[PDB]
Design a protein around this ligand. Structure first.
Ligand SMILES: [Cu+2]
Length: 124
């Protein structure tokens, strides 16, 4: 399966957002992160990806396709706008085994609130 996520200056949950903020995918699925507005990228958050998965970081303005394989939660951010809360979550599979470890990760406050909301939306 193939998915799109937009990086936007504004959307449903306000300013500086990933839309959708959460996505539940299967191993081998692909996500294309599209900065439909200028000035955004996608980067894995430290401490918020499954053991073994590969960290990534796109270029600003790049439509960036990533394939997800290792099960669990993946926290992502927009590098320049992380402090503004510009984050999202991709979750591979139900019952993510790294949930405990990723809830322990430190994020700036607005990012943490939006990551907590995303993780709840994913059923956790
Ligand atoms: Cu951004």
């Amino acid at each position: 399966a193939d998915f799109e996520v937009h990086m936007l200056n504004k959307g449903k949950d306000g300013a500086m957002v990933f839309e959708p903020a959460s996505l539940k995918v299967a191993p081998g699925d692909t996500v294309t992160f599209i900065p439909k507005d200028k000035g955004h990228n996608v980067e894995t958050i430290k401490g918020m990806i499954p053991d073994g998965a590969e960290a990534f970081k796109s270029k600003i303005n790049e439509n960036y396709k990533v394939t997800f394989t290792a099960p669990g939660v993946y926290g992502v951010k927009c590098t320049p706008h992380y402090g503004m809360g510009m984050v999202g979550v991709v979750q591979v599979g139900d019952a993510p085994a790294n949930l405990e470890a990723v809830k322990g990760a430190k994020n700036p406050k607005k990012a943490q609130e939006r990551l907590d909301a995303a993780l709840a939306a994913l059923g956790n």
